[PDB]
Amino acid sequence: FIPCPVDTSQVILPPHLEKIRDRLAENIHELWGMNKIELGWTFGKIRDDNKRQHPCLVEFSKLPETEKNYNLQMSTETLKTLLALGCHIAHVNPAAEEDLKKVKLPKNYMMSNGYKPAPLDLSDVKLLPPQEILVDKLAENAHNVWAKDRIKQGWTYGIQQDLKNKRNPRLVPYALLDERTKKSNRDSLREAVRTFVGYGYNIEP
Ligand SMILES: Nc1ncnc2c1ncn2[C@@H]1O[C@H](COP(=O)(O)OP(=O)(O)CP(=O)(O)O)[C@@H](O)[C@H]1O
Numbered sequence: 155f156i157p158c159p160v161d162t163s164q165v166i167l168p169p170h171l172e173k174i175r176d177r178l179a180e181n182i183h184e185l186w187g188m189n190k191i192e193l194g195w196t197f198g199k200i201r202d203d204n205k206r207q208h209p210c211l212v213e214f215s216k217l218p219e220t221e222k223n224y225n226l227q228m229s230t231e232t233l234k235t236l237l238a239l240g241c242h243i244a245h246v247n248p249a250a251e252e253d254l255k256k257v258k259l260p261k262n263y264m265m266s267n268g269y270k271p272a273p274l275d276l277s278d279v280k281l282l283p284p285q286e287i288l289v290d291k292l293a294e295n296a297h298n299v300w301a302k303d304r305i306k307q308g309w310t311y312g313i314q315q316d317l318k319n320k321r322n323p324r325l326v327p328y329a330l331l332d333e334r335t336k337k338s339n340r341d342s343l344r345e346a347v348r349t350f351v352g353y354g355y356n357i358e359p
């Protein structure tokens with residue numbers, strides 16, 4: 155398999171966008187954390203799958219650095235992909251970042267070590283058709299960068315998953331992937347673009 159995403163090599167992130175890059179990394183983690191609780195996952199200091207344990211059930215500020223820093227790199231590369239695709243990222247209203255509310259996660263969405271995700275409540279945020287074809291493209295590219303970075307870490311495909319010999323069945327072309335995983339990814343990058351407009355930024359090629 156040969157994944158190659160958009161080439162962001164020559165793009166430079168502006169320093170004033172390093173904050174929306176971090177806000178985006180927090181929220182996408184909060185969206186990941188919420189759905190993981192819905193899949194029957196709780197907090198724990200050691201990775202026990204049969205016990206529904208995962209250390210990174212804590213808030214974004216408390217993740218280990220080898221895991222936390224990859225999220226901030228994936229956020230940066232998604233921002234650079236927009237600029238590489240010819241989009242200008244501007245700022246529309248700064249008060250939009252203060253007229254931001256978060257979602258009322260029920261009491262069950264409170265974990266053992268006080269971690270309770272609270273993503274931005276962006277259910278009021280509609281997307282134009284051009285923005286739904288861009289989000290669909292963005293989620294496909296996000297798969298290629300994830301696939302190549304694991305291949306560059308030594309990962310190969312396998313019929314079943316192995317967390318030690320680096321094999322994983324999801325390292326396939328985006329058209330080869332199961333539709334359940336595609337949809338999960340397309341939704342996550344949908345909320346990514348929503349976070350930009352939700353924080354008051356504009357995105358037009
Ligand atoms: N699809 C995704 N979207 C956003 N963040 C993800 C992500 N997948 C993993 N992460 C990030 O990685 C951290 C969780 O560690 P990990 O990489 O092992 O995920 P995971 O255990 O769910 C993969 P698997 O589905 O195989 O179990 C979290 O902090 C999370 O933010």
Ligand SMILES: O=C1CN(/N=C/c2ncc(-c3ccc(Br)cc3)o2)C(=O)N1
Pocket residue numbers: 178179182224225226228229230232296297300324335339346
């Ligand atoms: O097919 C797949 C694709 N994929 N995605 C890896 C995921 N890990 C971290 C992130 C991420 C995305 C956006 C932002 Br902003 C910040 C972090 O992407 C996976 O795990 N199997």
